[PDB]
A paper describes a structure:
Polyubiquitylated proteins in isolation can be direct targets of the proteasome, whereas those embedded into membranes or assembled into multisubunit complexes need to be extracted or segregated by the conserved AAA-family ATPase Cdc48 (yeast) or p97/VCP (metazoan) with the aid of its cofactor complex, Ufd1–Npl4 (UN), prior to the proteasomal degradation. The UN heterodimer is one of the best-characterized cofactors. Here, we present the crystal structures of yeast Npl4 (zf-Npl4-MPN-CTD) in complex with Lys48-linked diubiquitin (K48-Ub2) and with Ufd1 at 2.55 and 1.58 Å resolutions, respectively. The crystal structures reveal that the distal and proximal Ub (Ubdist and Ubprox, respectively) moieties of K48-Ub2 interact with the C-terminal helix and N-terminal loop (N loop) of Npl4 CTD, respectively, and that Ufd1 binds to the groove of Npl4 corresponding to the catalytic groove of JAMM.
Author numbering:
A (entry chain A): 113 to 181, 188 to 443, 447 to 580
B (entry chain G): 1 to 71
C (entry chain I): 1 to 72
Write the structure that this text describes.
Amino acid sequence: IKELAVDEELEKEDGLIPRQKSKLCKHGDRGMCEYCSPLPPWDKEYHEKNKIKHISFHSYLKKLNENANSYISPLSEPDFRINKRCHNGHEPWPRGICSKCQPSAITLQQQEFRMVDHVEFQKSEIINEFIQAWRYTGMQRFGYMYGSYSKYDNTPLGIKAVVEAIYEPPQHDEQDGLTMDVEQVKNEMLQIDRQAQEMGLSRIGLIFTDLSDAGAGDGSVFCKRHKDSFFLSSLEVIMAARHQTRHPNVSKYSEQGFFSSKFVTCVISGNLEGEIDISSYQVSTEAEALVTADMISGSTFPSMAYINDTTDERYVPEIFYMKSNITVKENAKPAFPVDYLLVTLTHGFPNTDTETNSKFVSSTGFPWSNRQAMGQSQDYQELKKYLFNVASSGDFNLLHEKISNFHLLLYINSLQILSPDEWKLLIESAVKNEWEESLLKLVSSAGWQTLVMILQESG
Amino acid sequence: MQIFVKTLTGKTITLEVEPSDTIENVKAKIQDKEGIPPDQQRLIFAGKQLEDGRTLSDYNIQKESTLHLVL
Amino acid sequence: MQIFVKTLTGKTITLEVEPSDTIENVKAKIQDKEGIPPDQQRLIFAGKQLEDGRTLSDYNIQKESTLHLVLR
Ligand SMILES: OC[C@H]1O[C@H](O[C@H]2O[C@H](CO)[C@@H](O)[C@H](O)[C@H]2O)[C@H](O)[C@@H](O)[C@@H]1O
Ligand SMILES: OC[C@H]1O[C@H](O[C@H]2O[C@H](CO)[C@@H](O)[C@H](O)[C@H]2O)[C@H](O)[C@@H](O)[C@@H]1O
Ligand SMILES: OC[C@H]1O[C@H](O[C@H]2O[C@H](CO)[C@@H](O)[C@H](O)[C@H]2O)[C@H](O)[C@@H](O)[C@@H]1O
Ligand SMILES: OC[C@H]1O[C@H](O[C@H]2O[C@H](CO)[C@@H](O)[C@H](O)[C@H]2O)[C@H](O)[C@@H](O)[C@@H]1O
Ligand SMILES: OC[C@H]1O[C@H](O[C@H]2O[C@H](CO)[C@@H](O)[C@H](O)[C@H]2O)[C@H](O)[C@@H](O)[C@@H]1O
Ligand SMILES: OC[C@H]1O[C@H](O[C@H]2O[C@H](CO)[C@@H](O)[C@H](O)[C@H]2O)[C@H](O)[C@@H](O)[C@@H]1O
Ligand SMILES: OC[C@H]1O[C@H](O[C@H]2O[C@H](CO)[C@@H](O)[C@H](O)[C@H]2O)[C@H](O)[C@@H](O)[C@@H]1O
Ligand SMILES: OC[C@H]1O[C@H](O[C@H]2O[C@H](CO)[C@@H](O)[C@H](O)[C@H]2O)[C@H](O)[C@@H](O)[C@@H]1O
Ligand SMILES: [Zn+2]
Ligand SMILES: [Zn+2]
């Protein structure tokens, strides 16, 4: 019922692609003809010629709606789970089975559309500070990306995830790899989600490192992920599917009210030239459904998803996949390249020419959370070193720069010294385009002056 | 009424006090349940250092208010 | 009493200490069982950085409190 602003706006756009006028046009400036009429936003051939690997969601949505032409919602998510409430002349699964309740054979295929087209990191310092954790410790790291979604104009009806900050939960890089799907992470992130919502930020994706120094003394790294190994592993694909399912995308045009997800998955790793690069992905709605039905697992090989057994808990039908040499239909069992579950996105930073719109002025200078293993603790000393001097000075431009900082804000809020109203005021002083009036109100406020008092004597 | 006292370690202890209570009286009320001698206690409310002479209502410390305790 | 210390390895280890114990003593109690030398340990308690001289009762560290271990 309540869609994101970007979805309401793209819905109103027609997405028509203009075409070159042709020597064959024999109308004047009077109307169009078969040679010069515009392309619809999903034009397969326009996307191939311009190397756009998937059509956008809203280009896909408009394609489905032309093909609908009484109402039937054009979008519905796949469900592969056996119908367990079937009491149709037999006991329910696992005691009985019939054609109404068992899932039919599944055919997996590369998804022609992607929910999000592009990942824009608002400043490259956001990426560099995140990578510092690997530079200092040698451990791979993961964080959750906060931001929002808006229009992307390099592809018809495109959407981009605009990343404003990265938050790292508690993690250790040990015998189980990176561990995101654990209670400790989930309960801390619920708190962060709540506080970053108060900053006008959503949790929009996941980023993690797979970095290995190449031994060349030039900062270069090994290329581990590429077309002849794997892009994301099976286990990472399964994790993206759970994340997407837990970050559902709201859509009027789906019977359930939800359709797939705008949550994006980025990996920082070496490219074929040995440079540290970013690769961005989402998984298909088939992958979401497979993982909801608990049908796949990690396999010996990173590029291969393993297909699970029918049990008394889950029923697994035949599963095929459309492989391209031109295509052909293969049996997906016992394992299949998890590639077919991915969609790929582009990524970038805004050009440095124009004015910035980043919510936060700085992304570094104050310790990020959960970097004790890096010698970065969030202390009353560290906050005093960061803030107290500048706060006493009475320089508003400098005070604005220092508090316009995601992890600084979250840390101050955790101290629970400012009131909820005063916390709103600090937030406004940090992210607002017109922040002066808010910063004044805040600095004269009671909670704020208590905080400056606490730092003063904290020493 | 009831006022909160919050140390720097995050722990928040509740107090039963009157608006007429002296701040010295509130420092005793912290010591008895937390064992902390009043000379080590510096109470802060609203960016001001509280004074043993004044009262809670001199500083407009109403119900469900939160003092901060620094050692 | 029992106090928790949260290390660099993700681990949270329980510790048996008394209110009169020094912080230097607690750093040794971490060293033997977690292998981290007292000079590499920087102990923090809820945003207060501890000192080898004082004791747990000086910092109002009661039972079931949690110290944080930071590298250096
Ligand atoms: O005169 C400019 C008007 O059209 C602009 O958009 C162009 O591209 C659209 C793609 O669908 C077309 O539908 C539209 O007719 C084209 O002109 C834009 O909408 C505005 O600047 C003006 O309405
Ligand atoms: O490693 C950082 C390099 O780029 C910075 O310059 C800009 O980089 C991005 C655009 O590509 C911006 O988003 C970022 O905010 C700018 O700082 C840096 O200044 C360069 O010195 C570095 O080579
Ligand atoms: O890579 C480890 C080094 O990290 C810091 O240096 C980097 O980050 C600074 C602040 O962004 C940059 O000014 C500097 O150019 C980067 O190299 C740290 O200060 C170094 O001591 C570490 O060796
Ligand atoms: O297309 C939806 C909205 O996109 C923009 O707003 C988003 O991106 C901004 C960049 O910082 C954020 O400040 C804002 O919070 C996001 O919602 C656009 O400015 C809006 O007008 C659109 O509604
Ligand atoms: O004790 C098992 C722990 O490992 C889990 O990690 C993942 O990798 C496993 C082996 O490759 C998979 O079987 C499993 O499905 C994955 O989730 C996990 O991190 C831990 O919580 C488990 O205890
Ligand atoms: O980011 C690379 C890691 O991917 C896997 O771990 C994630 O996915 C698992 C389920 O497939 C979750 O249980 C786990 O909590 C996630 O972190 C893999 O198991 C790790 O070894 C990889 O480092
Ligand atoms: O200093 C410019 C920004 O990007 C930097 O990239 C550096 O990464 C390493 C620093 O430890 C070194 O390989 C070398 O200084 C650069 O390649 C730096 O990481 C960032 O902190 C800066 O924002
Ligand atoms: O505004 C047009 C484009 O802006 C970005 O790209 C430019 O700025 C980047 C930051 O240095 C450069 O890396 C890039 O090469 C520039 O062309 C944005 O990333 C693009 O998608 C926009 O089309
Ligand atoms: Zn024509
Ligand atoms: Zn049945």
